[PDB]
Amino acid sequence: APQFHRPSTITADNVRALGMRGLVLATNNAQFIMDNSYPHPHGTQGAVREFLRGQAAALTDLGVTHANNTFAPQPMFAGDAAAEWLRPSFGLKRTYSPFVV
Amino acid sequence: APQFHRPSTITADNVRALGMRGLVLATNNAQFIMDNSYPHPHGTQGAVREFLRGQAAALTDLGVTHANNTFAPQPMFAGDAAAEWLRPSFGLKRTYSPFVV
């Protein structure tokens, strides 16, 4: 469990193991006093670098729980097809409704 | 127990002992003729400060009876968040209907 009032606490695995919904209220219930007794070893700019890599890895975990809601992502653009010498590489204008009943 | 027809009966406890709904009826059903034999000792305008403090506290009573109906007051403006060194603070423009099914 990471503590958001200390820069030397947040790692990538502490944010990823916490859920996306649980990441909302954990950041809103922190401490207003910022502690400077133990800073991050890569500087204060490096603690921003470590925290947000765990959020984008949690979007991949959110896509797993919603894999029964959307479909397999088709290739979007040209140049990517298995058999290109008889048919071209298609690509979707993704304006549809990705939804599984 | 307050009585509206005399100056020196209304105190702070006398306004808040009756709620918002009952204060509609008893002030619309009070006496026309004002008595003046023993006025309010801080003057007849001093009790004007004494009554109306119980009204804005009487919707904090109605805030509790609708705490199971309305929402928690989110900060309407920025600057109010526990963490401001990694994430910003929004503020909800409370155009929404405080309404819980």
Add this chain to the structure above:
Amino acid sequence: YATLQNMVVPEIAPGEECPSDPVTDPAHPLHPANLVANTVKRMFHNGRV
């Protein structure tokens, strides 16, 4: 980016359709039960889209 991947997504009921209205359906993410302070789907509702 810290408030783009910051939203409230309720899980859909088994056998129910998609939420379309933020005003009535509480499973909609822009519903006033989901409009928390400091988030962007409430900022989808502060600035109404």
